[PDB]
Design a protein around this nucleic acid. Sequence first.
RNA 1: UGAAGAGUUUGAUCAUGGCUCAGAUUGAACGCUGGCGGCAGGCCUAACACAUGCAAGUCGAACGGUCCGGAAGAAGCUUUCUUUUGGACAGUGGCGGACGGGUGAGUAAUGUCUGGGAAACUGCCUGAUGGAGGGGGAUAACUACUGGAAACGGUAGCUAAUACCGCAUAACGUCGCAAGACCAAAGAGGUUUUCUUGCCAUCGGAUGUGCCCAGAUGGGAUUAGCUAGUAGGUGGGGUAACGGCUCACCUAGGCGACGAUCCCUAGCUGGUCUGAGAGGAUGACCAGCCACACUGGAACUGAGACACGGUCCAGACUCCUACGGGAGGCAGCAGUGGGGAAUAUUGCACAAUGGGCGCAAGCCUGAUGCAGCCAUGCCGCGUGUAUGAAGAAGGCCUUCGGGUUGUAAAGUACUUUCGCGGGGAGGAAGGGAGCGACGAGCUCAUUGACGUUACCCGCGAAGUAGCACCGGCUAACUCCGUGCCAGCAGCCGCGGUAAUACGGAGGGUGCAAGCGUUAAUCGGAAUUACUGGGCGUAAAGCGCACGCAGGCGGUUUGUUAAGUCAGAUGUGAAAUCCC
Lengths: 101, 78, 79, 83
Amino acid sequence: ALEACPQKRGVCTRVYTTTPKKPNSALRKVCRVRLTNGFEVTSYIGGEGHNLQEHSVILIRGGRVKDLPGVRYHTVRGALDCSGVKDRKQARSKYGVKRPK
Amino acid sequence: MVTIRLARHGAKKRPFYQVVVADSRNARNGRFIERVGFFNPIASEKEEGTRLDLDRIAHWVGQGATISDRVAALIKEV
Amino acid sequence: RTLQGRVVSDKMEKSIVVAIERFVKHPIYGKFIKRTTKLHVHDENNECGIGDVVEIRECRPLSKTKSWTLVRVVEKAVL
Amino acid sequence: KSAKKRAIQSEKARKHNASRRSMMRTFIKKVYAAIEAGDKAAAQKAFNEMQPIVDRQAAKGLIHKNKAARHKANLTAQINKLA
RNA sequence: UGAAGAGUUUGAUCAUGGCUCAGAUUGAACGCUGGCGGCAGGCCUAACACAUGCAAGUCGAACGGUCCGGAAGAAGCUUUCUUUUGGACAGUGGCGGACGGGUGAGUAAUGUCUGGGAAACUGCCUGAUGGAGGGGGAUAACUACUGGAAACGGUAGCUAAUACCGCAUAACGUCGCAAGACCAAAGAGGUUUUCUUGCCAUCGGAUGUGCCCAGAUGGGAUUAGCUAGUAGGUGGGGUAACGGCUCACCUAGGCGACGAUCCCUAGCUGGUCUGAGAGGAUGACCAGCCACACUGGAACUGAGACACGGUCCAGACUCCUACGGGAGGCAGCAGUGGGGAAUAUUGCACAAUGGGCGCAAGCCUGAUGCAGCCAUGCCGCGUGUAUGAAGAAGGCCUUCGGGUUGUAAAGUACUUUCGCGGGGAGGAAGGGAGCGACGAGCUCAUUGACGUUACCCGCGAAGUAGCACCGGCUAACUCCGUGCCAGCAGCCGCGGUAAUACGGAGGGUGCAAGCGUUAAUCGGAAUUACUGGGCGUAAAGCGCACGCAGGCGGUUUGUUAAGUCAGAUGUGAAAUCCC
């Protein structure tokens, strides 16, 4: 976070997929982000589906992914272009998903 | 200019003025030179409304200490 | 103020430098520490010489560096 | 009021004290010059025209106390010498 | 009256070691979840750029006109016009803007902190002494004319003061020698021969400051020799004053491992938080000090600003413009836009308290006193409180026996919200008027919230509710689906047909809008350990000799007694820490 700030914005450079380590196997969704801090780190994309393109621009939280060595940050869904998960009945507090009527 | 006015301890539902001799420059509730008594507008806390302590102020009076209009009234009441 | 020191130099005229030393405890450890200071005392009579442990008292600043003057000589010599 | 009035006076004010000190350094040098030459009479007489003028400047905010007494002491100290 | 940590390196154990977890705080926020009420609080990100309004005036007991208002005249009425008078705007004249308010960039330095010293100053105010005689001179307003689009400016004429200047008296003060000479000063107003306001000179007081000194004040030497006015002397210049502060001459020193110089960072402090203490971190609200207002530099006038609404010069920007030339700069209040995860009414008002000016009347005062928006926090009520059937439904859990939610899951009443009506606080009384010399003092009246909130009284409807989590640490369970499949995970791990850690459902725990979560600060770590530690094998003794500084060092006596110790006194910044 550099300035030790809770959150930091950044423009995505590429929204590619990565595979877990030895004990796991899947297609975890990540994306390189150029935070305003001047650093280009990779953040994980929580949820079963996102809508992040090339000019996504999403706020970074900060969390290490035991599966993906390097991804020490998590994306905050529900802020900016990062649309919250759809039909999220459970984790709405996270991923940012308004309670259906 | 050394003046003798009232120092408002003023608090939500607690009006108490402290007739003190201090410099005119200093704030109303700043560092004072020496207290000579007190004043209770409502006189509810204690029966003794005010305690001028004549002899005390009698010293500053003439030393160059001037008393305000309001305080003068309380002081005159002795 | 009276200070005691040594005459480590008598090169200048009417001006002698006295090396005063003191012992103070460390603000943290507390152990005694040695600290000295050079003071240019006045000596119009050029009486005091090198090796003389004289007394120093505060007087009218004869100059910018000299604000002290010779009072009395404790001993005779100890280079 | 007119913030300019206080501006013009201050400027013209310096113009005054400027001429006053002029007479000072003009006659003070004259006295010293006379003393240096040896002329006693003409000198002292010229000294009695510098003492007042410098004292009069003290009456106002021209030379003030201190600096005024200084010049008087120095002048009289430079005349009793070369004389 | 003061001290209980845990998880993770092994197949297992001990030792070492780093990381990590719950605590308090922060001028916040995003994600999803909303009722109310008191109190408190709000751009911690771009000193980024800013629309609009506001942020200092006040005096006619200084002087001529205009505007507004009243009264009395010449007149039969009207027009017109005359005199007197109140307020004030324009001008002239006096005082004030360097107080208050905002911000923290810059800054390591007696800048600040603590105690002293003196080569000093101090408007208004207070005490004491003395005095105020005669005279002369100048510039506006106004009047006339001309130039310009405007700002604004040029010329000619008249004129006054508590505006300037020359001479006396000297209480005194200053200067040489030693124990002599020189140098001051404006009235006005009235209940006017009596006071009031003010002035000139001197001493002192009060208060506020300039300057100097001892000690203390972050990180790095992969920053070490550095320095020419640079160190000292004489004389001079300069200033309110000491000082190479500045100049000439002479001398040639001065400083450094008790680390100068250089570089980096940060307003500082009191304090705040934490801790048994020591100590660590921080210093945001409030109080003191310092520094800074378009960027940079400088000077003047003054008691004091080298001075936001003062001035001069350099640079950039925005706006106006018949482009000739001008007007500004909210890191002042509110507010806008941008940025950002993000932080509000371009609201109301002066009576109170306090401040500036005035004799007073009185005027000014978004300083401030309140309201509004946002649960951001805290206090008495988030998803309810109390009441309630051996309990026939529904939601939840289940060993399918049962159990649980038990206003019913219906209702009803509620703490009593909300809402409506009335009264309406100060937790402060004057201004004014009457008595008194509109002085002291006494008496009386008006004005209530801030150009109506709080609280009290009356009336009165029940009047939303959701999120996180349930393998262990973490308090809280199984069935079904899927099946190393999909997925969970801070660490140890779990899932290959019984998975409480995957998705769903019933049930349960937490929060009771907080609780979780994210970020930031402190200790536990006796893992720098002064109190609390180690170096044969775990990280760790220099290969040896010798030797400088330094540290330490036998015994006896005397003086000094600087260190050390003791009594008294001054300061102990204030605030706080502690009680």
